[PDB]
């Protein structure tokens, strides 16, 4: 039902009501491609080392390796990203989990609208539980994707999760 508004640059935005002090503060409070996805992290209390992907290049090094994870552990996924020039409207995160060729999950979150800024943004998912049991160990293939209201295609990368008895 929601219908995205007309594209508007940050300058077109500042030009509007530019003599209104109160709106000037509003815009101040709230404010290479435009959106750059930089890092994927696994936030996990029980993990013996840091679990991170750099996504600023070399996207051809998964599926060669993965994140190892002890079966049954709680964790969140933290994606970092950068907005460089203009507003991204209503950015969405979509995830498809594969096991042995079968799609076992699909999940997607409204991350939101974000203006350009120096420091990267960090988006944290809700808590998830690593699989367990004799039949659920080894590798899961994961297809991560971003999209937004001005774009009907995606930023896509693909990563692996390998579930073990031990860390």
């Amino acid at each position: 039902n929601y219908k995205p508004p007309a594209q508007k640059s940050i300058q077109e935005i500042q030009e509007l009501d530019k003599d209104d002090e109160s709106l000037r503060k509003y815009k101040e409070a709230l404010l290479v491609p435009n959106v750059v996805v930089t890092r994927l992290t696994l936030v996990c209390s029980t993990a013996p080392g840091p679990l991170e992907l750099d996504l600023t290049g070399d996207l051809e090094s998964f599926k060669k390796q993965s994140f190892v994870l002890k079966e049954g552990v709680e964790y969140r996924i933290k994606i970092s990203f950068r907005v460089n020039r203009e507003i991204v409207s209503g950015m969405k995160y979509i995830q498809h989990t594969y096991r042995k060729g079968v799609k076992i999950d699909k999940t997607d979150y409204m991350v939101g609208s974000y203006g350009p800024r120096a420091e990267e943004y960090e988006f944290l998912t809700p808590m998830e539980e690593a699989p367990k049991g004799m039949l659920a160990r080894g590798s899961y293939n994961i297809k991560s994707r971003f999209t937004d209201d001005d774009r009907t295609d995606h930023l896509s990368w693909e990563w692996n999760l390998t579930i073990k008895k031990e860390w």
Binding site: N1, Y2, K3, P5, A6, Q7, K8, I13, L16, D17, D20, E21, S22, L23, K25, Y26, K27, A29, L30, L31, R76, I87, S89, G90, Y93, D108, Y109, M110, V111, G112, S113, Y114, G115, Y121, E122, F123, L124, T125, P126, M127
Partner: protein, 184 residues
């Protein structure tokens, strides 16, 4: 315990005054800014202490692409219209609900009728009557609250301050009761 509240709704339905009355306890009669600076009010509800962060917004079409930056990490939304403007109420399901649900899935909405004090104002009734309309009625408000899946429907006047502390007590109760967990 931090919660974030964002107040949305049509231009001139009384968003800003509501917010100012809540922090200052005085209706502004001299000057009303277009958007009041966000600020942090220390409220207590149901035997519990709450750091409540309040964001006013710009309702205009022109800021449709700007305003949605206020939403990330929002815990409760005050979605207003004015009791003296059945148009402002028609836009609830035509604009504010499609937007708020789009950017804030799973987030409780309190539908808020502003300017109660105009329900029975003489001059007001005439103006509305001159375009074949009357003030909005509580049933029309509550009906809408059900139609859009609002946690509640509250009515208020920031002029007389009746209902103001109760609106935000409800929003705060909504936030404690309640896509993606956190953005930083």
């Amino acid at each position: 315990i931090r919660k974030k509240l964002v107040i949305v709704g049509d231009g001139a339905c009384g968003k800003t005054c509501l917010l100012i009355v809540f922090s200052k306890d005085q209706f502004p009669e001299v000057y009303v800014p277009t958007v009041f600076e966000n600020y942090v009010a220390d409220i207590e509800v149901d035997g519990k202490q709450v750091e409540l962060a309040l964001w006013d917004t710009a309702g205009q079409e022109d800021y449709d692409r700007l305003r949605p930056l206020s939403y990330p990490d929002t815990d409760v939304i005050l979605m207003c219209f004015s009791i003296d403007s059945p148009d402002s109420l028609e836009n609830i399901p035509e604009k504010w609900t499609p937007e708020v649900k789009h950017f804030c899935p799973n987030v409780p909405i309190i539908l808020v009728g502003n300017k109660k004090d105009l329900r029975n104002d003489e001059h007001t009734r005439r103006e509305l009557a001159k375009m074949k309309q009357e003030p909005v009625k509580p049933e029309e408000g509550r009906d809408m609250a059900n139609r859009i899946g609002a946690f509640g429907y509250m009515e208020c006047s920031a002029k007389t301050k009746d209902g103001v502390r109760e609106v935000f007590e409800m929003a705060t109760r909504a936030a404690l009761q309640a896509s993606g967990c956190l953005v930083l």
